[PDB]
Amino acid sequence: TIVIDLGKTLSKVSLWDLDGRMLDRQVRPSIPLEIDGIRRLDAPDTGRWLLDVLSRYADHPVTTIVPVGHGAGIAALTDGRLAFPPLDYEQSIPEAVMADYRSQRDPFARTGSPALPDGLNIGSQLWWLDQLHPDVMANATLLPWAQYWAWFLTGRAVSEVTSLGCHSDLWDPQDGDFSPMAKRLGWAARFAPIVRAGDTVGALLPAIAERTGLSPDVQVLAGLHDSNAALLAARGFAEIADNEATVLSTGTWFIAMRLPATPVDTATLPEARDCLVNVDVHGRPVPSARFMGGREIETLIEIDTRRVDIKPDQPALLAAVPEVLRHGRMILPTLMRGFGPYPHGRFAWINRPEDWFERRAAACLYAALVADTALDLIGSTGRILVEGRFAEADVFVRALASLRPDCAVYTANAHNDVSFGALRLIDPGLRPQGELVRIEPLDTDLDTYRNRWQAEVE
């Protein structure tokens, strides 16, 4: 089996065995492609690199390939070939063109897709493209980035739901269909037939099976969006699986993605407080809430050298919590105006600690409280799995455990390559590396603290 993970900053090709262990991995940064001053995903060139690396695994019993793509990427095929390299979603879009688009979008209540800058909304790209290449767009078959690669190897164009549900303006999460807008504009009619991520797109193209030395019998799967890969993975853990659970990824962005066990009313979610609606590989709504956690923490600690996740530092970070707690030393939101649950929270310290450990420990508390608010906006309960670098942040995770006392907060036991998830598309019985360890609340308290914090915020 082979997973192709063509993300935004890193493209990874990986070879695995039927027991779900990685045999090899080939990586390569993704460099932008200039075309008019217009930044593009380098499709032609990536296609090459990955026909090389694919050749390397010709001696192996490969029976399946599954594609993985970052979101906010859309590809167009004119007369059965790539019309042009897709736009880089970070590529700017002209002011007048965007405003025109902005004023014709569907309500957030149907789409769960918030207005985002540049190309983050696929609709914005399409809107613009309709101007730059009017004819080529009308003759075009449309097809998400991830699925583009499954057509590169297969000749069959298909779409998959999770890329469409990635704040694209093209999807109606609750309805499980294209949005009124995408239909209205005739965009929905241009898309390749929707298929399930685990479905077989088809056998490897003969001309391709050749120069890679892979068997013509190799089967390509529809594939999925970068972010849903991790969800598949998380659902591999015995505690997550099919249960009501939420995965909270951390980094520059802290993102809560809930996997509801019951039907939820997403049309009621607060767009202004940085929530959105994604979709799982089954087409079921994935209520989401983010805030730029990692960015705010970094504002506080200034340099990589004082990152709150540095391992040997944990005990001292941890031991410094007691005094932070009882002196009411805390931080008020927000440090990123316009983002998260408290877009306009007037930032401020209170009894600012004068040493780094106590300031670094308190930073981990502020992120727990804001994550706490974010998890509640979407009805997260029961099981929470923390991932990303802030999983090694003892003060953060344990503060979370304390805030959600009857909830089971988790962190992973061993590292798992970012591409593992896709394997579970073939063999669902397959599980990640390590096990989940439940997080103990902070040693004794946090109510009085949060109570003060909350009161102050208001």
PDB file of N, CA, C and O in Angstrom, residues 371-436:
ATOM      1  N   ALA A 371      -9.678  27.293  25.014  1.00  0.00           N
ATOM      2  CA  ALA A 371     -10.015  26.021  24.384  1.00  0.00           C
ATOM      3  C   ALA A 371     -11.292  25.486  25.012  1.00  0.00           C
ATOM      4  O   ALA A 371     -12.133  24.894  24.338  1.00  0.00           O
ATOM      5  N   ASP A 372     -11.429  25.715  26.313  1.00  0.00           N
ATOM      6  CA  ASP A 372     -12.612  25.302  27.057  1.00  0.00           C
ATOM      7  C   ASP A 372     -13.865  25.973  26.504  1.00  0.00           C
ATOM      8  O   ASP A 372     -14.893  25.329  26.313  1.00  0.00           O
ATOM      9  N   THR A 373     -13.770  27.274  26.255  1.00  0.00           N
ATOM     10  CA  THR A 373     -14.872  28.021  25.666  1.00  0.00           C
ATOM     11  C   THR A 373     -15.176  27.526  24.253  1.00  0.00           C
ATOM     12  O   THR A 373     -16.338  27.410  23.865  1.00  0.00           O
ATOM     13  N   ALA A 374     -14.125  27.229  23.493  1.00  0.00           N
ATOM     14  CA  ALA A 374     -14.278  26.787  22.110  1.00  0.00           C
ATOM     15  C   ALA A 374     -14.920  25.405  22.007  1.00  0.00           C
ATOM     16  O   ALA A 374     -15.783  25.174  21.161  1.00  0.00           O
ATOM     17  N   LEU A 375     -14.492  24.493  22.873  1.00  0.00           N
ATOM     18  CA  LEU A 375     -15.058  23.153  22.916  1.00  0.00           C
ATOM     19  C   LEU A 375     -16.542  23.191  23.254  1.00  0.00           C
ATOM     20  O   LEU A 375     -17.321  22.385  22.753  1.00  0.00           O
ATOM     21  N   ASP A 376     -16.929  24.135  24.103  1.00  0.00           N
ATOM     22  CA  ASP A 376     -18.326  24.277  24.513  1.00  0.00           C
ATOM     23  C   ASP A 376     -19.223  24.867  23.427  1.00  0.00           C
ATOM     24  O   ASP A 376     -20.395  24.513  23.335  1.00  0.00           O
ATOM     25  N   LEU A 377     -18.677  25.768  22.616  1.00  0.00           N
ATOM     26  CA  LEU A 377     -19.421  26.336  21.489  1.00  0.00           C
ATOM     27  C   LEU A 377     -19.988  25.273  20.551  1.00  0.00           C
ATOM     28  O   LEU A 377     -21.003  25.500  19.902  1.00  0.00           O
ATOM     29  N   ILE A 378     -19.334  24.118  20.481  1.00  0.00           N
ATOM     30  CA  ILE A 378     -19.729  23.072  19.540  1.00  0.00           C
ATOM     31  C   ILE A 378     -20.293  21.833  20.234  1.00  0.00           C
ATOM     32  O   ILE A 378     -20.609  20.841  19.579  1.00  0.00           O
ATOM     33  N   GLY A 379     -20.411  21.890  21.556  1.00  0.00           N
ATOM     34  CA  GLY A 379     -20.998  20.799  22.314  1.00  0.00           C
ATOM     35  C   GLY A 379     -20.086  19.603  22.514  1.00  0.00           C
ATOM     36  O   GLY A 379     -20.564  18.481  22.683  1.00  0.00           O
ATOM     37  N   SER A 380     -18.776  19.838  22.501  1.00  0.00           N
ATOM     38  CA  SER A 380     -17.799  18.774  22.738  1.00  0.00           C
ATOM     39  C   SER A 380     -17.952  18.194  24.139  1.00  0.00           C
ATOM     40  O   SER A 380     -17.974  18.929  25.126  1.00  0.00           O
ATOM     41  N   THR A 381     -18.056  16.871  24.216  1.00  0.00           N
ATOM     42  CA  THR A 381     -18.153  16.175  25.490  1.00  0.00           C
ATOM     43  C   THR A 381     -17.547  14.782  25.399  1.00  0.00           C
ATOM     44  O   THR A 381     -17.218  14.307  24.312  1.00  0.00           O
ATOM     45  N   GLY A 382     -17.406  14.136  26.553  1.00  0.00           N
ATOM     46  CA  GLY A 382     -17.074  12.724  26.609  1.00  0.00           C
ATOM     47  C   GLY A 382     -15.604  12.387  26.457  1.00  0.00           C
ATOM     48  O   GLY A 382     -14.950  11.982  27.415  1.00  0.00           O
ATOM     49  N   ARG A 383     -15.088  12.542  25.243  1.00  0.00           N
ATOM     50  CA  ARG A 383     -13.708  12.189  24.949  1.00  0.00           C
ATOM     51  C   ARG A 383     -13.040  13.278  24.131  1.00  0.00           C
ATOM     52  O   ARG A 383     -13.553  13.684  23.091  1.00  0.00           O
ATOM     53  N   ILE A 384     -11.896  13.753  24.607  1.00  0.00           N
ATOM     54  CA  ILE A 384     -11.116  14.732  23.866  1.00  0.00           C
ATOM     55  C   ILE A 384      -9.690  14.240  23.667  1.00  0.00           C
ATOM     56  O   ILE A 384      -9.000  13.897  24.624  1.00  0.00           O
ATOM     57  N   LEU A 385      -9.258  14.200  22.413  1.00  0.00           N
ATOM     58  CA  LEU A 385      -7.900  13.797  22.085  1.00  0.00           C
ATOM     59  C   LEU A 385      -7.092  15.011  21.654  1.00  0.00           C
ATOM     60  O   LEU A 385      -7.383  15.625  20.627  1.00  0.00           O
ATOM     61  N   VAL A 386      -6.090  15.366  22.453  1.00  0.00           N
ATOM     62  CA  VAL A 386      -5.196  16.467  22.113  1.00  0.00           C
ATOM     63  C   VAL A 386      -4.060  15.960  21.231  1.00  0.00           C
ATOM     64  O   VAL A 386      -3.451  14.931  21.523  1.00  0.00           O
ATOM     65  N   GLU A 387      -3.787  16.678  20.147  1.00  0.00           N
ATOM     66  CA  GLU A 387      -2.677  16.352  19.257  1.00  0.00           C
ATOM     67  C   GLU A 387      -1.889  17.617  18.946  1.00  0.00           C
ATOM     68  O   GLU A 387      -2.233  18.702  19.420  1.00  0.00           O
ATOM     69  N   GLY A 388      -0.837  17.482  18.147  1.00  0.00           N
ATOM     70  CA  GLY A 388       0.036  18.603  17.850  1.00  0.00           C
ATOM     71  C   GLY A 388       1.072  18.789  18.940  1.00  0.00           C
ATOM     72  O   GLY A 388       1.112  18.019  19.899  1.00  0.00           O
ATOM     73  N   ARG A 389       1.905  19.817  18.811  1.00  0.00           N
ATOM     74  CA  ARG A 389       3.018  20.001  19.739  1.00  0.00           C
ATOM     75  C   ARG A 389       2.597  20.338  21.170  1.00  0.00           C
ATOM     76  O   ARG A 389       3.322  20.038  22.117  1.00  0.00           O
ATOM     77  N   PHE A 390       1.428  20.946  21.333  1.00  0.00           N
ATOM     78  CA  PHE A 390       0.976  21.355  22.659  1.00  0.00           C
ATOM     79  C   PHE A 390       0.395  20.193  23.464  1.00  0.00           C
ATOM     80  O   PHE A 390      -0.145  20.381  24.553  1.00  0.00           O
ATOM     81  N   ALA A 391       0.515  18.990  22.912  1.00  0.00           N
ATOM     82  CA  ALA A 391       0.218  17.769  23.652  1.00  0.00           C
ATOM     83  C   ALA A 391       1.296  17.480  24.691  1.00  0.00           C
ATOM     84  O   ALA A 391       1.023  16.896  25.734  1.00  0.00           O
ATOM     85  N   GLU A 392       2.520  17.896  24.377  1.00  0.00           N
ATOM     86  CA  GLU A 392       3.635  17.769  25.305  1.00  0.00           C
ATOM     87  C   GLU A 392       3.621  18.897  26.329  1.00  0.00           C
ATOM     88  O   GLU A 392       4.540  19.017  27.137  1.00  0.00           O
ATOM     89  N   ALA A 393       2.575  19.718  26.292  1.00  0.00           N
ATOM     90  CA  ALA A 393       2.445  20.843  27.219  1.00  0.00           C
ATOM     91  C   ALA A 393       1.650  20.458  28.468  1.00  0.00           C
ATOM     92  O   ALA A 393       0.449  20.716  28.558  1.00  0.00           O
ATOM     93  N   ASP A 394       2.341  19.848  29.430  1.00  0.00           N
ATOM     94  CA  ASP A 394       1.720  19.333  30.653  1.00  0.00           C
ATOM     95  C   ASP A 394       0.739  20.288  31.332  1.00  0.00           C
ATOM     96  O   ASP A 394      -0.325  19.873  31.784  1.00  0.00           O
ATOM     97  N   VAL A 395       1.099  21.560  31.423  1.00  0.00           N
ATOM     98  CA  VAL A 395       0.232  22.528  32.081  1.00  0.00           C
ATOM     99  C   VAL A 395      -1.066  22.705  31.299  1.00  0.00           C
ATOM    100  O   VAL A 395      -2.141  22.836  31.888  1.00  0.00           O
ATOM    101  N   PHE A 396      -0.963  22.698  29.975  1.00  0.00           N
ATOM    102  CA  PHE A 396      -2.136  22.864  29.120  1.00  0.00           C
ATOM    103  C   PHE A 396      -3.105  21.689  29.228  1.00  0.00           C
ATOM    104  O   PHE A 396      -4.261  21.866  29.611  1.00  0.00           O
ATOM    105  N   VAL A 397      -2.630  20.498  28.908  1.00  0.00           N
ATOM    106  CA  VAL A 397      -3.453  19.294  28.879  1.00  0.00           C
ATOM    107  C   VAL A 397      -4.069  19.015  30.246  1.00  0.00           C
ATOM    108  O   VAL A 397      -5.277  18.703  30.330  1.00  0.00           O
ATOM    109  N   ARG A 398      -3.284  19.070  31.305  1.00  0.00           N
ATOM    110  CA  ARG A 398      -3.780  18.781  32.650  1.00  0.00           C
ATOM    111  C   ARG A 398      -4.776  19.833  33.144  1.00  0.00           C
ATOM    112  O   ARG A 398      -5.707  19.516  33.883  1.00  0.00           O
ATOM    113  N   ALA A 399      -4.577  21.081  32.737  1.00  0.00           N
ATOM    114  CA  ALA A 399      -5.534  22.131  33.053  1.00  0.00           C
ATOM    115  C   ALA A 399      -6.849  21.821  32.355  1.00  0.00           C
ATOM    116  O   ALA A 399      -7.928  22.085  32.882  1.00  0.00           O
ATOM    117  N   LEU A 400      -6.749  21.251  31.160  1.00  0.00           N
ATOM    118  CA  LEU A 400      -7.930  20.871  30.400  1.00  0.00           C
ATOM    119  C   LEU A 400      -8.673  19.748  31.117  1.00  0.00           C
ATOM    120  O   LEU A 400      -9.894  19.787  31.262  1.00  0.00           O
ATOM    121  N   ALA A 401      -7.925  18.750  31.571  1.00  0.00           N
ATOM    122  CA  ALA A 401      -8.508  17.648  32.327  1.00  0.00           C
ATOM    123  C   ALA A 401      -9.281  18.149  33.551  1.00  0.00           C
ATOM    124  O   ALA A 401     -10.377  17.664  33.847  1.00  0.00           O
ATOM    125  N   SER A 402      -8.709  19.130  34.248  1.00  0.00           N
ATOM    126  CA  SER A 402      -9.331  19.700  35.441  1.00  0.00           C
ATOM    127  C   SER A 402     -10.624  20.428  35.105  1.00  0.00           C
ATOM    128  O   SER A 402     -11.626  20.296  35.811  1.00  0.00           O
ATOM    129  N   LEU A 403     -10.596  21.207  34.029  1.00  0.00           N
ATOM    130  CA  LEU A 403     -11.773  21.954  33.600  1.00  0.00           C
ATOM    131  C   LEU A 403     -12.909  21.018  33.195  1.00  0.00           C
ATOM    132  O   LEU A 403     -14.076  21.305  33.450  1.00  0.00           O
ATOM    133  N   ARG A 404     -12.556  19.897  32.573  1.00  0.00           N
ATOM    134  CA  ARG A 404     -13.535  18.901  32.148  1.00  0.00           C
ATOM    135  C   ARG A 404     -13.377  17.619  32.959  1.00  0.00           C
ATOM    136  O   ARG A 404     -12.900  16.601  32.447  1.00  0.00           O
ATOM    137  N   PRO A 405     -13.795  17.665  34.232  1.00  0.00           N
ATOM    138  CA  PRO A 405     -13.507  16.646  35.254  1.00  0.00           C
ATOM    139  C   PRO A 405     -14.040  15.245  34.921  1.00  0.00           C
ATOM    140  O   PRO A 405     -13.333  14.259  35.143  1.00  0.00           O
ATOM    141  N   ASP A 406     -15.265  15.160  34.410  1.00  0.00           N
ATOM    142  CA  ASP A 406     -15.873  13.875  34.086  1.00  0.00           C
ATOM    143  C   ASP A 406     -15.564  13.493  32.647  1.00  0.00           C
ATOM    144  O   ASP A 406     -15.850  12.379  32.212  1.00  0.00           O
ATOM    145  N   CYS A 407     -14.993  14.434  31.907  1.00  0.00           N
ATOM    146  CA  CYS A 407     -14.572  14.171  30.541  1.00  0.00           C
ATOM    147  C   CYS A 407     -13.228  13.452  30.557  1.00  0.00           C
ATOM    148  O   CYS A 407     -12.427  13.640  31.472  1.00  0.00           O
ATOM    149  N   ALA A 408     -12.990  12.617  29.553  1.00  0.00           N
ATOM    150  CA  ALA A 408     -11.721  11.912  29.440  1.00  0.00           C
ATOM    151  C   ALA A 408     -10.818  12.572  28.401  1.00  0.00           C
ATOM    152  O   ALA A 408     -10.956  12.331  27.203  1.00  0.00           O
ATOM    153  N   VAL A 409      -9.898  13.411  28.866  1.00  0.00           N
ATOM    154  CA  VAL A 409      -8.909  14.037  27.991  1.00  0.00           C
ATOM    155  C   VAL A 409      -7.755  13.074  27.721  1.00  0.00           C
ATOM    156  O   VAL A 409      -7.247  12.428  28.636  1.00  0.00           O
ATOM    157  N   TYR A 410      -7.341  12.976  26.465  1.00  0.00           N
ATOM    158  CA  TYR A 410      -6.307  12.020  26.079  1.00  0.00           C
ATOM    159  C   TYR A 410      -5.106  12.667  25.389  1.00  0.00           C
ATOM    160  O   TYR A 410      -5.195  13.775  24.860  1.00  0.00           O
ATOM    161  N   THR A 411      -3.985  11.954  25.405  1.00  0.00           N
ATOM    162  CA  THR A 411      -2.831  12.272  24.570  1.00  0.00           C
ATOM    163  C   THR A 411      -2.259  10.956  24.068  1.00  0.00           C
ATOM    164  O   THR A 411      -2.385   9.932  24.734  1.00  0.00           O
ATOM    165  N   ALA A 412      -1.645  10.982  22.889  1.00  0.00           N
ATOM    166  CA  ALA A 412      -1.136   9.768  22.263  1.00  0.00           C
ATOM    167  C   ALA A 412       0.146   9.261  22.926  1.00  0.00           C
ATOM    168  O   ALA A 412       0.903  10.034  23.510  1.00  0.00           O
ATOM    169  N   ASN A 413       0.374   7.955  22.819  1.00  0.00           N
ATOM    170  CA  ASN A 413       1.494   7.290  23.473  1.00  0.00           C
ATOM    171  C   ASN A 413       2.770   7.387  22.652  1.00  0.00           C
ATOM    172  O   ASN A 413       3.837   7.714  23.171  1.00  0.00           O
ATOM    173  N   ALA A 414       2.650   7.080  21.365  1.00  0.00           N
ATOM    174  CA  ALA A 414       3.781   7.127  20.454  1.00  0.00           C
ATOM    175  C   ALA A 414       3.479   8.033  19.271  1.00  0.00           C
ATOM    176  O   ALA A 414       2.320   8.329  18.980  1.00  0.00           O
ATOM    177  N   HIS A 415       4.532   8.480  18.596  1.00  0.00           N
ATOM    178  CA  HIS A 415       4.378   9.261  17.380  1.00  0.00           C
ATOM    179  C   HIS A 415       3.680   8.425  16.317  1.00  0.00           C
ATOM    180  O   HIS A 415       3.857   7.208  16.257  1.00  0.00           O
ATOM    181  N   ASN A 416       2.880   9.085  15.487  1.00  0.00           N
ATOM    182  CA  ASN A 416       2.283   8.452  14.320  1.00  0.00           C
ATOM    183  C   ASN A 416       2.499   9.335  13.108  1.00  0.00           C
ATOM    184  O   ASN A 416       2.195  10.526  13.147  1.00  0.00           O
ATOM    185  N   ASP A 417       3.034   8.768  12.032  1.00  0.00           N
ATOM    186  CA  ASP A 417       3.242   9.554  10.827  1.00  0.00           C
ATOM    187  C   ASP A 417       1.920  10.165  10.385  1.00  0.00           C
ATOM    188  O   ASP A 417       0.873   9.518  10.439  1.00  0.00           O
ATOM    189  N   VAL A 418       1.980  11.414   9.946  1.00  0.00           N
ATOM    190  CA  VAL A 418       0.784  12.171   9.604  1.00  0.00           C
ATOM    191  C   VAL A 418      -0.113  11.447   8.594  1.00  0.00           C
ATOM    192  O   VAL A 418      -1.314  11.719   8.516  1.00  0.00           O
ATOM    193  N   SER A 419       0.463  10.513   7.839  1.00  0.00           N
ATOM    194  CA  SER A 419      -0.256   9.854   6.745  1.00  0.00           C
ATOM    195  C   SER A 419      -0.945   8.537   7.124  1.00  0.00           C
ATOM    196  O   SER A 419      -1.599   7.913   6.283  1.00  0.00           O
ATOM    197  N   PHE A 420      -0.811   8.112   8.376  1.00  0.00           N
ATOM    198  CA  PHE A 420      -1.359   6.818   8.778  1.00  0.00           C
ATOM    199  C   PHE A 420      -2.854   6.694   8.507  1.00  0.00           C
ATOM    200  O   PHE A 420      -3.310   5.686   7.964  1.00  0.00           O
ATOM    201  N   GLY A 421      -3.610   7.717   8.896  1.00  0.00           N
ATOM    202  CA  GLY A 421      -5.058   7.683   8.816  1.00  0.00           C
ATOM    203  C   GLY A 421      -5.622   6.962   7.610  1.00  0.00           C
ATOM    204  O   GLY A 421      -6.535   6.151   7.737  1.00  0.00           O
ATOM    205  N   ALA A 422      -5.078   7.257   6.435  1.00  0.00           N
ATOM    206  CA  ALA A 422      -5.590   6.706   5.184  1.00  0.00           C
ATOM    207  C   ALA A 422      -5.650   5.176   5.162  1.00  0.00           C
ATOM    208  O   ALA A 422      -6.540   4.597   4.547  1.00  0.00           O
ATOM    209  N   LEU A 423      -4.700   4.521   5.820  1.00  0.00           N
ATOM    210  CA  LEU A 423      -4.706   3.063   5.900  1.00  0.00           C
ATOM    211  C   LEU A 423      -6.050   2.537   6.392  1.00  0.00           C
ATOM    212  O   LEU A 423      -6.541   1.512   5.917  1.00  0.00           O
ATOM    213  N   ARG A 424      -6.644   3.250   7.343  1.00  0.00           N
ATOM    214  CA  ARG A 424      -7.910   2.836   7.937  1.00  0.00           C
ATOM    215  C   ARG A 424      -9.059   2.899   6.934  1.00  0.00           C
ATOM    216  O   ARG A 424     -10.179   2.477   7.223  1.00  0.00           O
ATOM    217  N   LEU A 425      -8.766   3.420   5.751  1.00  0.00           N
ATOM    218  CA  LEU A 425      -9.739   3.478   4.675  1.00  0.00           C
ATOM    219  C   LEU A 425      -9.799   2.109   3.992  1.00  0.00           C
ATOM    220  O   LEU A 425     -10.828   1.717   3.431  1.00  0.00           O
ATOM    221  N   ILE A 426      -8.682   1.387   4.053  1.00  0.00           N
ATOM    222  CA  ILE A 426      -8.598   0.032   3.526  1.00  0.00           C
ATOM    223  C   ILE A 426      -8.981  -0.968   4.608  1.00  0.00           C
ATOM    224  O   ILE A 426      -9.943  -1.721   4.463  1.00  0.00           O
ATOM    225  N   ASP A 427      -8.210  -0.967   5.690  1.00  0.00           N
ATOM    226  CA  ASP A 427      -8.459  -1.847   6.824  1.00  0.00           C
ATOM    227  C   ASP A 427      -8.847  -1.044   8.068  1.00  0.00           C
ATOM    228  O   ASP A 427      -7.983  -0.612   8.828  1.00  0.00           O
ATOM    229  N   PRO A 428     -10.156  -0.839   8.271  1.00  0.00           N
ATOM    230  CA  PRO A 428     -10.673  -0.124   9.442  1.00  0.00           C
ATOM    231  C   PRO A 428     -10.241  -0.755  10.769  1.00  0.00           C
ATOM    232  O   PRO A 428     -10.137  -0.043  11.767  1.00  0.00           O
ATOM    233  N   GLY A 429      -9.996  -2.061  10.779  1.00  0.00           N
ATOM    234  CA  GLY A 429      -9.573  -2.747  11.990  1.00  0.00           C
ATOM    235  C   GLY A 429      -8.187  -2.330  12.450  1.00  0.00           C
ATOM    236  O   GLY A 429      -7.783  -2.604  13.578  1.00  0.00           O
ATOM    237  N   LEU A 430      -7.465  -1.653  11.567  1.00  0.00           N
ATOM    238  CA  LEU A 430      -6.092  -1.238  11.828  1.00  0.00           C
ATOM    239  C   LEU A 430      -6.029  -0.044  12.786  1.00  0.00           C
ATOM    240  O   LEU A 430      -6.820   0.893  12.681  1.00  0.00           O
ATOM    241  N   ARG A 431      -5.074  -0.078  13.712  1.00  0.00           N
ATOM    242  CA  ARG A 431      -4.963   0.961  14.733  1.00  0.00           C
ATOM    243  C   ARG A 431      -3.636   1.713  14.667  1.00  0.00           C
ATOM    244  O   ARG A 431      -2.660   1.213  14.109  1.00  0.00           O
ATOM    245  N   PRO A 432      -3.600   2.924  15.244  1.00  0.00           N
ATOM    246  CA  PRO A 432      -2.389   3.755  15.265  1.00  0.00           C
ATOM    247  C   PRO A 432      -1.301   3.151  16.144  1.00  0.00           C
ATOM    248  O   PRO A 432      -1.482   2.065  16.698  1.00  0.00           O
ATOM    249  N   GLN A 433      -0.178   3.849  16.267  1.00  0.00           N
ATOM    250  CA  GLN A 433       0.886   3.421  17.166  1.00  0.00           C
ATOM    251  C   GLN A 433       0.602   3.923  18.573  1.00  0.00           C
ATOM    252  O   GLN A 433      -0.020   4.970  18.756  1.00  0.00           O
ATOM    253  N   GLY A 434       1.055   3.167  19.564  1.00  0.00           N
ATOM    254  CA  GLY A 434       0.846   3.525  20.951  1.00  0.00           C
ATOM    255  C   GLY A 434      -0.597   3.354  21.381  1.00  0.00           C
ATOM    256  O   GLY A 434      -1.403   2.723  20.695  1.00  0.00           O
ATOM    257  N   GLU A 435      -0.918   3.915  22.538  1.00  0.00           N
ATOM    258  CA  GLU A 435      -2.270   3.885  23.066  1.00  0.00           C
ATOM    259  C   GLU A 435      -2.586   5.255  23.629  1.00  0.00           C
ATOM    260  O   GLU A 435      -1.697   6.090  23.775  1.00  0.00           O
ATOM    261  N   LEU A 436      -3.854   5.492  23.942  1.00  0.00           N
ATOM    262  CA  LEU A 436      -4.230   6.737  24.594  1.00  0.00           C
ATOM    263  C   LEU A 436      -4.043   6.619  26.100  1.00  0.00           C
ATOM    264  O   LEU A 436      -4.444   5.629  26.713  1.00  0.00           O
TER     265      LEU A 436
END
